[PDB]
Amino acid sequence: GPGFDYAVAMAKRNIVTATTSKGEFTMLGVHDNVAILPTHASPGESIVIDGKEVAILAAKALADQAGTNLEITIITLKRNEKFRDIRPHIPTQITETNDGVLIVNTSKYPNMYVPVGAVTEQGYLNLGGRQTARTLMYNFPTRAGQAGGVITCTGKVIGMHVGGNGSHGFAAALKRSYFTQSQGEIQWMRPSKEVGYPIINAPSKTKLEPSAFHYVFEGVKEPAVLTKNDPRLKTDFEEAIFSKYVGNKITEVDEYMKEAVDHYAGQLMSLDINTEQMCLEDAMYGTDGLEALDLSTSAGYPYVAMGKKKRDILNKQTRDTKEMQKLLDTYGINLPLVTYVKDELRSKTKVEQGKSRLIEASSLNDSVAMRMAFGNLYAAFHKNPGVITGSAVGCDPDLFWSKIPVLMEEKLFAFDYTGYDASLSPAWFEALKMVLEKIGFGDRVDYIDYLNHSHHLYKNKTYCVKGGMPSGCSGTSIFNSMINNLIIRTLLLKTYKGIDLDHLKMIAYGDDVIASYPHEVDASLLAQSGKDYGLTMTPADKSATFETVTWENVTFLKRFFRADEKYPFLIHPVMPMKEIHESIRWTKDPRNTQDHVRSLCLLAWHNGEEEYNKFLAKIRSVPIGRALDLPEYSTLYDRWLDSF
Amino acid sequence: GPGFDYAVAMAKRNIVTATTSKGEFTMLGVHDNVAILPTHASPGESIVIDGKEVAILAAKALADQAGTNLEITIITLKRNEKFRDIRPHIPTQITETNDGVLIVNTSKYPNMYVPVGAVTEQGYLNLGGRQTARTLMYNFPTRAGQAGGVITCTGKVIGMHVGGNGSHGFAAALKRSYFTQSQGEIQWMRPSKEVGYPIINAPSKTKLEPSAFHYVFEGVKEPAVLTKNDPRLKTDFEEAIFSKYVGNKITEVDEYMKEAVDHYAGQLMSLDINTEQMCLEDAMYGTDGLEALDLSTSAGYPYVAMGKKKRDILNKQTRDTKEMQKLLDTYGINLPLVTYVKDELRSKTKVEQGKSRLIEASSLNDSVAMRMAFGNLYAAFHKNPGVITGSAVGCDPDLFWSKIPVLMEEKLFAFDYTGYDASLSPAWFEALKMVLEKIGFGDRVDYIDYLNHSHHLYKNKTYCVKGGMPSGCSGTSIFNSMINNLIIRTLLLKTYKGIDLDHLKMIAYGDDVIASYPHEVDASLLAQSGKDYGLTMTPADKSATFETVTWENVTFLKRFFRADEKYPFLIHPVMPMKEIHESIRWTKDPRNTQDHVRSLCLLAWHNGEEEYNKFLAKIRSVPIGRALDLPEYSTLYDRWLDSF
Ligand SMILES: [Zn+2]
Ligand SMILES: [Zn+2]
Hints:
The structure is a homodimer of 644-residue chains.
Chain A (H helix, E strand, L loop, with lengths): L1 H13 E6 L2 E9 L2 E5 L7 E4 L2 E7 L2 E3 L5 E9 L19 E8 L7 E14 L6 E7 L11 E4 L2 E9 L4 E5 L14 E4 L17 E2 L11 E2 L13 H6 L12 H14 L11 H6 L36 H10 L5 E5 L3 E2 L1 H5 L5 E4 L2 H19 L14 H11 L3 E3 L1 E3 L2 H4 L2 H16 L4 H7 E5 L3 E6 L9 H20 L9 E5 L2 E6 L5 H10 L4 E3 L20 E4 L7 E4 L2 H8 L1 E2 L5 H12 L4 H11 L3 H4 L6 H11 L1
Parallel strand pairs in A: 17-22
Antiparallel strand pairs in A: 1-2, 1-4, 2-3, 3-7, 4-5, 5-7, 6-7, 8-9, 8-11, 9-10, 10-13, 11-12, 12-13, 14-23, 15-29, 16-18, 17-19, 20-25, 21-26, 22-23, 24-25, 27-28
Helix pairs in contact in A: 3-10, 3-12, 10-11, 10-12, 12-13, 14-15
The complex binds zinc ion (2 copies).
């Protein structure tokens, strides 16, 4: 029989003998360094295993939702001893079997395998002094000290022996849950050298240095943490940066999402997007509604390991493709994403807690391939920022801010997401595929699969991520925005049952969304419905409670909305000075103070004439500042009126 | 409003004016050449469309399961006129909407868009003389001749206007079903030149020619059809060879399959398979339990277009990998499968009906990569043909036949599949992944995804297949056999509720399976349960009815089981002479008659001494036959006893 043979096979590498201050026990090694044993076997600071001492990093007792004991403790051993990951053998729920086997192994009961027959649920048990729950009953005169032993059946490890009453034997039922699941973070990981890929170099030291205005203005942000030994860290870094991946919350597209899909794909058809493919040249060198390949960003794999930038490939005015074509025929597509730590400014917390953001750069091949595939889709969205596309990607706030309120419905609502790009369950990509599918792109939905399921080359490792939207791929913003559209709809449909999406007016830019409806909706109620779809929603502008969003307090890019005094329907996109002060204090190339400070003024002046003058006054309080060619308020304000 | 704008957008390219002998009607073009119109608009042999005559290839009326009229006819136009595929806009079920729009367009009612408000189900209607079903009711004084018009709502095309009663308007509800779905065959297809890939050459004329024994023996098989113009064909060939893909029947792994999974993965652990990776060299040049790369088979993409065989890459005794490594780093993996028409012998029917089998060759890169990935798994299965692996792949019938009946349970059952490899729903691969996942290979389940979702380069086209097991990839046999194991279990579990899989004894070789259980099961009942999982099962040996399988009639490879007269427990694998007669009559290289006829004798002699002597006698009735070095019965029979 294979049930017996199974019991032996599991035991051969996942069952060991453990000695506590309360005798020998059979112990199931569940995964890595995690093993379980009966609670009454009170684990101490250390423990004797197959001959010698092993320390306990930390132990955990187990109880249920009622507080009732489960009679299971999950200890953690301090050693390089890796158990076979046998979590998958543990059932997801309390399992009964008509032909179970008790596995015990101590110096008192060596290699014991008992055919205990039927294994049914006992429910509530009253085991010596301490009442227990989630137990299984098998009718076999279980003797003392067989505790710890495991109960299996062909292909399943269902219970842990914890006791008996002379006639019967009892075991605490085992469930997958009980061990932090491996469906999140990463799917699998391992040494790049073991799977053909090469090691990725990464600048260790940051390229952000204090600017000429570091003391002129105040600020608290600092360059993000970039290596393991940054003394500013207050936690393990490796662990901290990967804690972004939270793993799939859902797989299936439910009715709400399908109808969210139907409606939004529906809206996109009034746009009459050109469902053709985009020629290589246009995808590369740009066309109407689409800027050429960004030369700043990385070239990705395998172009980084071969030392070859995007500049060395493109002929800006020659507009030559031959070079790029030969590459696409050679290295194909669907290539691993190179992963860098994003070198940027971060808050006091996100430095201490190592929350440095990661860059996953798509290979130039994918990059170009997806532009040929979705180029026309992108151009459509860029030439149409609004409430049809539901996208603000490509907009020009100086001008677009005056249209937004016209486009918006009567009662605004909005909220903040928390690690949006990574919280996107594979179910949302399928939803996204469906939308394409409906607007005449079902032809190349395979590319979304590429975004959902992607392997990354981190530094020393390669790993595959099943879920979440990568950060450095073509279309990222638009696809995130489109996905966002699907989400708001889904949540509205589920919360406010029988809503009317045709009066949903919203605009997204990635995770950022400004929405509206003729009736005031409850952000709170939605944020809850959000949990179910694996999304973490909190009140807009990092606010304490969910409050009513007004035109006086809503913010759409990091900017506010304020009417002009001379023309009540011209709306200034007001960027808070604090953000500008932060940014001006650091620089990655002090040969651009002119372009950098310039760019900031174009944001700062919408703060009012009184404000913007102080700002220049301060820039001009130091030599590098006075020697700068900066626009006066009128020059800008005047130009801004002719803008429209 | 976007509901209105939708109605217009759909109409712009999917609504046209059609004139029958009974006036003008609004007509919805649904996809390709398929369009619908009201039944009472009685379509003739031709029809006037936007100005001129268009012939009707064929028309179809529609009724329901009761026979009741639906008032819809789906005509087919004879022209290069492709409608936008808008099947996805059609809901899957009878849809109601609170805000519908009637779209009409004739010379009498140009560009008509009526906000008909709420659209509810009428159920049974009594429309002028002919009672109708699946109708929708909207309260708007619909006037005569607005029939044909469509009813939409944001993102959905839900009904076809068919009439009214003065106060209300009625429409036959639309459903996706109504148009042969596009979830099968192929997922998408199109010109290789449009997606970088090159054209694939294919020998037009067959390499099978009559052998020296074509008239000596009798037979009816012939070389398979290989090109469009073979005069033997009785149907369109292109269409006929692709009719193999039947499209996904299921996506989700249900409880029966998960438990089939649990049990079988369970069994495989007694084997203690080496869950490591296999070094490149062994994966390439062979090791214990694994033969080296097959040099006969194709090199695949892009090695075929570059004109470079596997021989020019491998150093049989040098065992050099550098050459292969540099290739894997260059062209990566997960490459399209090159598709050839398998040049083989076929029956009278399968020639007439163009059912020529297709070869989808995996790139040598995938090929080697999967051997490194699953090499150890394969070796385990080859060194263990039996009822543990549930696999006969790698067995040596001359010897293995005597073990099979010992290994088998007491009551045999078996059946035939129909296009098994292609009927495998994506749900079965997920199940397969789970099995790996449990036996310590979850680490490289991505490779199964490669088998499930694969693009092929046919000749002039590239297309992606979502579902079904490709024919020329590494592990095909083993993975098909493992999948088969999962299926039998699933069907047993669902039919004979509360079965006991530990007394299931079976052995598979691809789709071929010989199974048993202590109780006689009903193949019939199982074949039915099979339908639900997208599988087509019929009685074993192309038999008329499902009968009781006995040792006297069961067949496991194309061979029967017959005990030896001198040793009742030695079992001859008896290959039917007919198969041998067929095979001997053709050859692809007449410089091998020696090796070919030889090989046949090693099969033929288990048919008995009287038989095998006639067989030589006939081979030796012609010059090319007498001049052959062929083994006598004793020589073989004697050797066969020392075999074991
Ligand atoms: Zn992966
Ligand atoms: Zn595909």
